[PDB]
Design a protein around this nucleic acid. Structure first.
Ligand SMILES: Nc1ccn([C@@H]2O[C@H](COP(=O)(O)CP(=O)(O)OP(=O)(O)O)[C@@H](O)[C@H]2O)c(=O)n1
Lengths: 199, 76, 101
RNA sequence: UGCUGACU
DNA sequence: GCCAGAGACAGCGAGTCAGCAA
DNA sequence: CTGTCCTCTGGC
């Protein structure tokens, strides 16, 4: 019954990850304890969640928990079919051992039609975003980046870079070309604000 | 129009240097010198009286510039 | 690889830095006509940036691209069009290059 | 240029 | 194609004064 | 005298 503890931690972390992306999540899911998780729900196909977005109610996300410890191209297709038929665009695949290396470039191959993304199970046992040293990241909107570049007379290159595989760019699901504001809690100035172009 | 109103120390240094190099090349002194042979003392005397017709052209990191007057600049 | 790198260089020359990964993904999802349309659209809509291309983060990308090319794609290989075109140049100490039969 | 001493 | 075997290869504080031999 | 390259080589 440690499998259930792992399932509960991963589900709580994914609920927090979905709330930080701006999806409609209730307080109970974010404050759900183990005794009630196991009360509700055992399997790995009824842990799949489907969440809606604050705006764009059609824009929803779908979280998978594949059974195969090493997901492959066929496993990816089997529920890319589910997504294509239910009419969703985004997904999130929590894998237990990894993805066979061809799969990673397949997930990338699926054009903005159906954009997927993978997360290891050991990466979700804790919320890195809740570490002391990790600042708060905020994906800037297309109209705030323009005002930033205009205030500092900048170009989008010539800005600090954040890797597209950064453990906190993968969590906040930030695509390339997006600028993220970062609020460092500084011992010197309190709440220093920086900006990083995702690339 | 958006940069600091005061005159940085580097600007004071360069303005004094240039005014002194001008005075030394036989330029008219608008400060009524009183027996001093140093052009840098004369340049300081002029800076204190707010008589220096030079235009500090502050360059921003993208090529854009702002032209300030040495008179319209708070000397500390 | 030849055409991908050609287009990536064409876009780097003007500064466009997202075009690099965009071209690579356009390729993998798919050759010259597929890539040259996007690359010309970039180089046209993003010109006026030949002076704003001599910045760090634009030199690192070109450095990495050309280094990876010279390091991974210039090894002796059986020839594509004629299967027996490995006239193995193999250079001894400088001032010496030896082709075989 | 070199090499052998020496100074802070 | 995956990653050891290496085997090159490059770096190694600042300034100063002499003499002697080639 | 150390650490990365980094260009093979070599085996697999
Ligand atoms: N090779 C060297 C030797 C010396 N120096 C410089 O000379 C200073 C005095 O040397 P020093 O040997 O007299 C040390 P100090 O603390 O003054 O000695 P004390 O305990 O007897 O009072 C050092 O601190 C360096 O700045 C150098 O640059 N390279």
């Amino acid at each position: 019954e440690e499998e259930t503890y792992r399932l509960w931690k991963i589900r709580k972390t994914i609920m927090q990850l979905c709330h930080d992306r701006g999806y409609l999540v209730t307080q109970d899911e974010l404050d759900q304890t183990l005794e009630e998780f196991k009360a509700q729900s055992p399997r790995r196909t009824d842990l799949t969640v489907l969440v809606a977005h604050n705006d764009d109610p059609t824009d929803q996300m779908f979280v998978f928990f594949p059974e195969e410890p090493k997901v492959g191209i066929k496993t990816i297709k089997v529920y890319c079919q589910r997504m294509q038929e239910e009419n969703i665009t985004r997904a999130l695949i929590v894998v237990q051992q990894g993805m066979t290396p061809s799969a990673k470039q397949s997930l990338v191959d699926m054009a903005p039609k159906y954009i997927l993304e993978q997360f290891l199970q050991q990466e979700l046992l804790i919320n890195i975003t809740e570490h002391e040293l990790v600042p708060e990241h905020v994906v800037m909107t297309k109209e705030e980046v323009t005002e930033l570049l205009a205030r500092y007379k900048l170009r989008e290159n010539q800005l600090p870079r954040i890797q597209a595989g950064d453990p906190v760019a993968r969590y906040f699901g930030i695509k390339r070309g997006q600028v993220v504001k970062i609020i460092r809690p500084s011992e010197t100035a309190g709440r220093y604000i920086t900006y990083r172009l995702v690339q | 129009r958006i940069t600091t109103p005061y005159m940085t120390k580097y600007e004071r240094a360069r303005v004094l240097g240039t005014r002194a190099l001008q005075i030394a090349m036989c330029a008219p002194v608008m400060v009524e010198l009183e027996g001093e042979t140093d052009p840098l003392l004369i340049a300081m005397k002029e800076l204190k009286a707010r008589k220096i017709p030079i235009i500090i052209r502050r360059y921003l990191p993208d090529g854009s510039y702002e032209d300030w007057g040495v008179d319209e600049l708070i000397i500390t | 690889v030849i055409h991908l790198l050609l287009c990536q260089l064409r876009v780097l020359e003007v500064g466009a830095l997202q075009a690099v990964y965009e071209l690579e993904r356009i390729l993998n999802r798919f050759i010259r006509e597929e890539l040259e349309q996007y690359t010309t659209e970039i180089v046209q809509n993003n010109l006026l940036g030949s002076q704003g291309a001599h910045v760090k983060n634009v030199c690192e990308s070109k450095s990495k691209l050309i280094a990876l090319f010279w390091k991974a794609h210039m090894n002796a290989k059986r020839c594509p069009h004629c299967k027996t075109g490995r006239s193995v140049v193999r250079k001894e100490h400088n001032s010496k290059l030896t082709i075989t039969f």
